[PDB]
Amino acid sequence: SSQIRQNYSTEVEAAVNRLVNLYLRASYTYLSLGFYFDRDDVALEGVCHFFRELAEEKREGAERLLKMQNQRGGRALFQDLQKPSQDEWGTTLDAMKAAIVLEKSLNQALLDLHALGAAQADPHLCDFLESHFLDEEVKLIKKMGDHLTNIQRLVGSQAGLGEYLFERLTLKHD
Amino acid sequence: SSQIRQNYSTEVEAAVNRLVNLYLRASYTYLSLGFYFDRDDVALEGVCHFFRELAEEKREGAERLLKMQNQRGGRALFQDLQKPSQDEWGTTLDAMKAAIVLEKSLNQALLDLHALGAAQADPHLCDFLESHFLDEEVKLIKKMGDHLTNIQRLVGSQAGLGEYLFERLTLKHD
Amino acid sequence: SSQIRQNYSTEVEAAVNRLVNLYLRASYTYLSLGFYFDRDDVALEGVCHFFRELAEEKREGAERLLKMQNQRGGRALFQDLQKPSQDEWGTTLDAMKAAIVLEKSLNQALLDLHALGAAQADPHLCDFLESHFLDEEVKLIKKMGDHLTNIQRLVGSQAGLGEYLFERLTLKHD
Amino acid sequence: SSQIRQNYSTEVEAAVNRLVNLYLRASYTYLSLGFYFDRDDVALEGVCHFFRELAEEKREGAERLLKMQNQRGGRALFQDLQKPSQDEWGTTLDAMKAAIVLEKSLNQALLDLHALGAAQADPHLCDFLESHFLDEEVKLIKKMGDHLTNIQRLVGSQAGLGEYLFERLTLKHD
Ligand SMILES: [Cl-]
Ligand SMILES: [Cl-]
Ligand SMILES: [Cl-]
Ligand SMILES: [Cl-]
Numbered sequence: 001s002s003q004i005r006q007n008y009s010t011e012v013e014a015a016v017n018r019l020v021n022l023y024l025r026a027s028y029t030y031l032s033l034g035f036y037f038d039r040d041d042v043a044l045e046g047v048c049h050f051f052r053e054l055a056e057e058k059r060e061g062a063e064r065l066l067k068m069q070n071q072r073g074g075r076a077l078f079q080d081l082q083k084p085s086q087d088e089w090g091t092t093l094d095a096m097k098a099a100i101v102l103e104k105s106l107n108q109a110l111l112d113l114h115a116l117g118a119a120q121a122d123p124h125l126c127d128f129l130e131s132h133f134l135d136e137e138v139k140l141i142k143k144m145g146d147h148l149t150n151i152q153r154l155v156g157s158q159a160g161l162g163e164y165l166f167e168r169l170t171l172k173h174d
Numbered sequence: 175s176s177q178i179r180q181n182y183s184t185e186v187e188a189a190v191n192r193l194v195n196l197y198l199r200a201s202y203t204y205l206s207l208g209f210y211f212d213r214d215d216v217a218l219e220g221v222c223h224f225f226r227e228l229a230e231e232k233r234e235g236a237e238r239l240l241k242m243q244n245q246r247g248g249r250a251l252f253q254d255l256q257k258p259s260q261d262e263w264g265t266t267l268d269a270m271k272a273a274i275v276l277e278k279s280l281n282q283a284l285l286d287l288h289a290l291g292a293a294q295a296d297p298h299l300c301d302f303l304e305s306h307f308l309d310e311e312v313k314l315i316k317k318m319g320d321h322l323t324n325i326q327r328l329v330g331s332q333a334g335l336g337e338y339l340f341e342r343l344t345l346k347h348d
Numbered sequence: 349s350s351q352i353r354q355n356y357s358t359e360v361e362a363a364v365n366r367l368v369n370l371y372l373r374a375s376y377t378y379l380s381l382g383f384y385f386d387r388d389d390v391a392l393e394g395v396c397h398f399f400r401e402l403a404e405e406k407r408e409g410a411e412r413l414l415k416m417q418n419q420r421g422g423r424a425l426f427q428d429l430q431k432p433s434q435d436e437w438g439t440t441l442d443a444m445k446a447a448i449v450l451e452k453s454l455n456q457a458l459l460d461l462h463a464l465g466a467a468q469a470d471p472h473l474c475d476f477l478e479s480h481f482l483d484e485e486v487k488l489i490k491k492m493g494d495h496l497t498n499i500q501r502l503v504g505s506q507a508g509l510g511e512y513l514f515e516r517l518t519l520k521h522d
Numbered sequence: 523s524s525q526i527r528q529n530y531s532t533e534v535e536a537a538v539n540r541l542v543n544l545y546l547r548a549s550y551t552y553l554s555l556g557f558y559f560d561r562d563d564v565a566l567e568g569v570c571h572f573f574r575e576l577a578e579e580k581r582e583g584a585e586r587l588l589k590m591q592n593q594r595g596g597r598a599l600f601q602d603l604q605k606p607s608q609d610e611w612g613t614t615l616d617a618m619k620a621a622i623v624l625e626k627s628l629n630q631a632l633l634d635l636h637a638l639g640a641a642q643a644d645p646h647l648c649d650f651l652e653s654h655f656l657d658e659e660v661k662l663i664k665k666m667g668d669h670l671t672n673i674q675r676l677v678g679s680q681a682g683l684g685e686y687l688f689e690r691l692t693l694k695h696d
Pocket of ligand 3: 257428
């Protein structure tokens with residue numbers, strides 16, 4: 001049993017475990033997106049690298065949450081990780097739209113947990129999210145929005161050409 | 175149109191644009207103060223440099239606010255920038271008193287925007303101000319207070335001598 | 349009062365203050381253009397950086413003019429800074445057309461002030477503009493003209509594609 | 523006889539020789555000022571160094587004029603150099619007032635020669651003065667004005683104290 005727990009509600013403990021599940025689900029989704037764009041019949045290396053990087057970022061987020069759970073004297077509880085929502089992710093545009101939807105859902109879960117921490121007068125939780133998650137999420141959604149706009153301007157009437165150019169000239173590749 | 179905006183009220187968007195206007199007005203005021211102390215008939219280089227540095231700091235503050243406005247999916251809207259309140263700024267003491275008045279007004283606008291963000295449950299906004307503005311402002315007002323006290327102790331009966339010494343021995347110059 | 353002023357007409361002093369206002373207005377316009385191209389629904393980083401750089405150049409021009417005003421024993425007088433002419437700046441082409449219009453107006457104000465200095469037999473003023481402004485302005489307008497031509501050749505029937513390519517392959521970005 | 527002279531009037535040739543005489547007279551005046559402030563009963567090292575530096579600057583100005591006279595195919599003609607106007611130069615304030623008077627007379631001679639060159643359509647002469655003399659003179663007069671203002675603020679009721687402090691804290695010394 002914990003000898004350290006102080007000002008750490010059962011509600012926050014549970015919500016932190018749910019959020020870990022959401023981050024790991026997001027990581028898994030990004031793993032699937034990354035490997036889809038590595039298929040020989042898709043072959044957009046920059047897109048693959050973008051999503052693989054995000055899989056790592058989301059796993060790291062989950063790990064930070066689990067570290068914090070222990071720091072507060074809460075108990076990590078893991079659940080089944082649902083498989084991603086799709087097996088094939090369509091075009092770069094389809095994929096980036098799906099990623100922004102996912103990110104907005106994570107962001108809402110962050111905001112909801114912040115509000116619960118504020119209601120419970122748990123400033124450590126609130127600070128933790130502010131310091132390590134809220135701005136990271138805002139920055140990422142801005143980046144995805146910027147990408148979506150560029151991808152959309154490139155569709156025009158020459159969709160394949162635009163998809164190639166975006167991958168070659170915006171996204172990081174070898 | 176924005177595809178990223180989330181948890182970002184129209185009230186906060188508008189107040190952020192007002193605050194940008196206040197920072198730019200403050201920058202302009204400091205530009206005028208800096209060049210006043212560079213006049214051949216005023217000639218207090220350290221005072222000039224102090225206010226020119228502040229003009230840059232305030233412009234940078236405005237730029238950070240504008241970057242954040244975009245990160246959140248709000249829309250920058252610029253207004254007329256009113257000219258500074260004075261064309262001539264009197265003594266170093268007069269100028270530092272005017273600067274502290276200006277700083278307290280900026281600080282109050284920061285606190286008001288923080289309170290609005292708290293009321294709107296917008297923790298990203300609240301964190302942003304905490305992290306980049308509130309302590310910077312407290313530190314600056316402390317510095318100005320410290321200067322005012324030194325300037326005031328130096329007036330005595332030999333005001334010109336004191337004004338020279340403060341500029342030479344407290345403020346940074348070549 | 350000044351003990352240094354020599355061969356420096358009231359007409360030139362006033363015109364220098366007007367020109368400072370024009371440079372600062374131009375800086376403000378470029379600030380607005382820069383942040384417009386940073387919007388998530390515009391997202392042309394190279395265009396954003398081009399105009400932000402110009403905002404800094406124009407502010408530096410104003411600062412040089414103010415330094416010179418003091419060097420000659422004139423008195424800086426600041427006016428209200430009008431807001432930019434537009435809140436949204438359209439396409440890269442629209443924006444670059446607006447920038448060239450702005451630059452031509454600044455250039456004309458430089459030429460007018462040079463002519464006034466020549467009429468007043470003020471060679472220091474004339475030299476100052478020659479040395480720090482006239483060629484800088486000619487070079488900048490040439491660069492903008494070169495950009496406009498490239499942007500125009502890229503419109504064709506695939507306007508989005510051309511706008512992306514210009515930003516990626518001509519303008520400086522990360 | 524010259525085989526190079528082109529577009530170089532006898533009027534400008536003569537005025538250039540007069541200006542050389544004025545620069546050398548100014549150098550001599552500064553030599554006298556420098557050594558006055560090195561007297562054991564005056565003993566203001568920073569003031570001494572300021573004026574000795576100016577003696578060198580004025581001699582260098584004369585040398586540049588003489589080089590240019592030869593470059594244009596004119597003929598240097600030297601006259602008697604009148605001794606400085608005073609044998610003793612009073613206070614630092616008296617001396618700096620005398621220096622500004624001297625500088626304004628040199629500046630007027632520069633402006634007069636520029637106007638003659640403009641009237642004679644001699645752009646090389648005009649450029650030469652612009653490039654090597656007019657701004658140097660404006661900068662120096664600004665510096666002297668700045669010094670005068672500081673010296674004047676330091677007189678107060680404690681003139682000796684102020685004169686010492688100005689020399690110690692504004693002027694360059696060992
Ligand atoms: Cl189970
Ligand atoms: Cl308006
Ligand atoms: Cl007004
Ligand atoms: Cl003789």
